[PDB]
Design a protein. Structure first.
Lengths: 404, 404
C-alpha cells in the first residue's frame, strides 16, 4: 500500500551539512542497495547509469552505491554485482559519478568483500577458495555445498591479511578515486568479511588479527589508517550493523556482546578524529532491520545510542524509517542533533524522486520485493516511467548493456 | 497585483548548466540589484548577509551582487552602496559568500565605477572629481550641480586609464577573490563608466582609448584580458545594455549605432573564447527595460539576437520576463538553446524564494518600488517574514549594522 507522509521540507532534513569536504543540501540518503544489474564482468551498466542518475536530482543528495567488489577474491555472488578493481570498472563508474555530480549531488562507493558466504562454485571458476578470518560456514548447508564442489572455506594467512590492506583495498581505493567517487565506504556489516573479522563467532585466529577484541578489530582499523593516508580520512566511511543476525552472526548471543565489539571500534575511530584524522561518517543499521530482513521489537536486543554517545562526527542511520509515518517521529528525533543523516533503501527503489516526495509529503509508491534481485530492467528503471508507458515484456528482456 | 504563473519545473529552467567552472542547477538568476543597505563606509552589513542568504536556498542558484564600488574614485552615490577595495570589505563579503556557498549556490560580484554621474558633492568630500572618458554631463542640471560646488567632471588622463586596469580593477579583483566570489562582473551597462568609454556620445578622447569604435572598446577589452590573467577567464562576466537610454545614453540615436558598438565587443570576446580564454558569461539587458525603467514596445529600437548569433557561450538575459506570464512564452523561447540564463530582479526583491515559486507555479508577491532604495530593513528583509509578524515601525528603524 502507498504510504501517506507529512512534508519534511521545514525540518532538519533540509538543512545543509558538511560531510568530509562536501556539503549535502538534504540529510536524506540512498544507502547501499544491491540490485544485480551490473554487467557479467562486473563493469557498471547502462541501466545503472540511469538508475543512479534518476536518484540524484535533488541537488546535494548523497547516494551510496550498492556493494561493490574490491577484487576477484572479494566476489562470490551468482547475480551480477559491480566491481571497482580494474581500469574498465573505474572508467564506467566515472560516467555514473560524472552524471550524479552534474546534478550537484555526491556519491560514496561501498567496498564489499564476501568472505565465508562466497558461493563456492562461483569462486571455483576463478580458481579461488571462499576465504575468511577463520575456516567457518554460516550453516551446515553452506559447508556441504562447498565440500561438495571440493572448494571448502579457508582461513586467510597473516600475509594474505596484509595483502588485503596494501593490495586489494589499496587498489580498490585508487580505482574509486579514478572513478570520481567522493567517498569509499568499508562494508563492515551484515556478516561479510570485515564483520567476520570483528566478531568472535567468525574469528578464532591466533595471529595478530584474532584472539581478543583488540586483535579482531585490528584489520578494520589498519584499513582505516592506511586508506586514510591514500585518499584522506575525509573521503572514508564505514558501515556496521551491531544488532544484525544476517548470515548467522550471533550478535547479542555471541561470546562478546555487540555493545562491546562495536563501542570498542567506534571509540577508536573517535580517537583518530581527536587527532585530526576523523573519517567522514559512520553508517549504522538500526535494530528494526537485520540485513534485508525486518526485525520485530520483541527481538530487538539493543539500540545504537552508544554510537551517538561515543562518536562526535556524522552518523548515517537507516532501517524502516517510515514505520511511524506519516509523522516521522523517530526520524525527527534521530536527526535533531544536527549531525545525523537518515537513509531509505527499499522506498528509494520504487521512488527515484524520494527526496522530493519526502520534502513535499507526496504519497510513496510501494516497492516490489519480487524485482529487487532479478537480472533485467523490469522493476528497476521502470519506476522512473509513467505507469502506462511501460512495456513490461520488453523491459523483462532488457538486460544490462555497456554504457553507450 | 499578484502574478499568476505556470510551473517551470519540467522546463529548461531546471536543467543544469556549467558556467565557468561551476554548475548551476537552475537557470533562474538574481541579477545585480542596488538596494543601499550597506554600511556607511561601504562594508557589507548584517541586513545584506541575510538578504543574499534568503535567496540562495534552491541549491545551485547563481546570485549576482548589487553594483559594488571598485575603489574610492568609483563611488558617488548618496545612498550607502557596498565596496570591494579594502580587506574589511572583503572579510565582510566573505561571510556572505560563505553563507551562499553553504546552500550549494554561487555568487558573482558586479564591479561598478560611476564615472560622470558621480554626485559632485559626495566626490568632493573624498577630495576627488567626478571622472569619465571625456568631460561630459548627463544633463545641463548635472553640469550646474557640479560647477556649483566647484567640482566639475574631468577626463581621465591616459595614465589614469592605465591605473584603472593595473591598480583599481586589479585590486578589486583580488579583494573579490579574498572575499570568496565565484565571479567578477564588469559593469559595462546603463551609462556608467565602462559604457561611457564604449559609446561616442560619452567618449570623444583623442588618445588610444577614443576616436574610433576599436579605441573606445580598448579599455574594456584591456580589463577583460588583464583580469583574465589575474582570476582566470572562467571567473569573469560582463553586463551590457545595448538599447538602454538610462543616464542619457543616446543608444540608437548616437553617431554609432549600438548594434555596431556591441557586436564589435561581443565578437572580440568570442575570438578570445576561440583562443581558450572565453569568459564565463555575457549579461545583456533586454530592450523591455532601460536601467530601472520599463520601455514600451513602440520605443524598442532593436533586440539582442546579435549576441546569440555572435557569442557561443553562456548568456544571461533579464528584463520584465513576467510580461507574458502565466505561460512564460518568451522566457521559454529564450532558454531553448540550452546556454541561456534568465534573470529576475524586481520580483526577487519581494520573493526571496523566487526560484521555488517559479519552479512550482506559486503566485508572486508584488514588489514595492517605494522601498527599493530606502536606508532601512522595511521592504528589504521583511519579505522573508510572515506578514503578520512584521513590526513595521521597528523595521523602519532597523538600519544596517556590522555583521555580528
Ligand atoms: C534489495 C536490498 C539490497 C541491499 N543491499 C545492501 C548492500 O549492498 N549493502 C548494505 O550495506 N546494505 C544493503 N541493504 C540493506 C539496506 O542498505 C538497508 O539498510 C535496509 O534495507 C534498511 O533500510 P530500509 O528499511 O529503508 O530498506 C540492502 C537491502 C535491500 C532490501
Ligand atoms: C531597484 C533596482 C536596482 C538595480 N540595480 C542594478 C545594478 O546595481 N546593476 C545593474 O546592472 N542593474 C541594476 N538594476 C537593473 C536590473 O538588474 C534589471 O536588469 C532590471 O530591473 C530588469 O529586470 P526585472 O524586470 O526582472 O526587474 C536594478 C534594477 C532595480 C529595479
Ligand atoms: O550487506 C548486504 C549486501 C547485499 C544485500 Cl542484498 C543485503 C545486505
Ligand atoms: O546599473 C544600475 C545600477 C543601479 C541602479 Cl539603481 C540601476 C541600474
Ligand atoms: Na539538476
Ligand atoms: Na541521532
Ligand atoms: Na540548503
Ligand atoms: Na536565447
Amino acid at each position: 500500500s502507498s504510504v501517506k507522509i507529512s512534508p519534511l521540507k521545514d525540518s532538519e532534513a533540509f538543512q545543509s551539512i558538511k560531510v568530509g569536504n562536501n556539503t549535502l543540501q538534504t540529510k536524506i540518503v540512498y544507502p547501499p542497495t544491491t540490485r544485480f544489474r551490473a554487467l557479467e564482468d562486473h563493469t557498471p551498466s547502462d541501466l545503472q547509469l540511469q538508475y543512479y542518475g534518476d536518484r540524484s536530482t535533488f541537488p546535494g543528495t548523497l547516494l551510496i552505491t550498492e556493494a561493490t567488489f574490491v577484487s576477484p577474491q572479494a566476489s562470490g555472488y551468482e547475480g551480477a554485482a559491480p566491481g571497482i578493481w580494474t581500469d574498465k570498472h573505474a572508467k564506467a563508474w566515472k560516467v555514473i559519478t560524472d552524471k550524479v555530480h552534474a546534478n550537484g549531488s555526491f556519491v560514496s562507493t561501498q567496498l564489499i568483500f564476501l568472505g565465508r558466504v562466497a558461493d563456492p562454485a562461483v569462486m571455483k571458476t576463478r580458481g579461488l577458495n571462499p576465504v575468511s578470518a577463520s575456516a567457518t560456514y554460516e550453516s551446515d548447508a553452506a559447508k556441504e555445498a562447498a565440500e561438495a564442489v571440493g572448494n571448502p572455506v579457508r582461513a586467510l594467512t597473516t600475509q594474505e591479511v596484509k595483502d588485503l590492506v596494501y593490495e586489494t583495498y589499496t587498489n580498490a581505493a585508487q580505482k574509486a578515486m579514478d572513478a570520481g567517487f567522493d567517498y569509499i565506504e568499508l562494508h563492515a556489516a551484515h556478516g561479510y568479511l570485515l564483520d567476520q573479522f570483528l566478531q568472535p563467532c567468525t574469528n578464532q585466529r591466533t595471529d595478530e588479527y584474532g584472539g581478543s577484541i583488540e586483535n579482531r578489530a585490528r584489520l578494520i582499523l589498519e584499513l582505516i589508517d592506511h586508506l586514510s593516508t591514500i585518499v584522506g580520512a575525509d573521503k572514508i566511511g564505514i558501515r556496521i550493523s551491531p544488532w544484525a543476525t544476517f548470515q548467522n552472526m550471533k550478535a547479542h548471543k555471541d561470546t562478546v556482546h555487540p555493545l562491546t565489539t562495536f563501542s570498542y571500534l567506534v571509540h577508536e575511530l573517535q580517537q583518530r578524529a581527536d587527532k585530526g584524522q576523523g573519517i567522514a561518517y559512520i553508517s549504522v543499521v538500526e535494530p528494526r532491520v537485520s540485513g534485508n530482513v525486518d526485525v520485530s521489537e520483541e527481538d530487538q536486543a539493543g539500540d545504537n545510542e552508544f554510537v551517538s554517545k561515543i562518536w562526535k562526527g556524522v552518523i548515517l542511520k537507516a532501517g524502516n524509517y517510515s514505520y511511524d509515518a506519516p509523522e516521522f517521529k523517530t526520524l525527527k528525533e534521530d536527526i535533531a542533533d544536527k549531525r545525523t543523516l537518515v537513509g531509505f533503501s527499499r522506498y528509494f527503489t520504487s521512488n527515484p524522486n524520494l527526496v522530493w516526495k519526502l520534502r513535499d509529503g507526496i504519497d510513496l509508491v510501494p516497492y516490489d520485493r519480487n524485482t529487487f534481485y532479478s537480472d533485467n530492467n523490469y522493476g528497476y528503471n521502470t519506476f522512473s516511467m509513467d505507469s502506462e508507458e511501460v512495456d513490461k515484456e520488453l523491459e523483462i528482456k532488457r538486460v544490462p548493456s555497456a554504457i553507450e
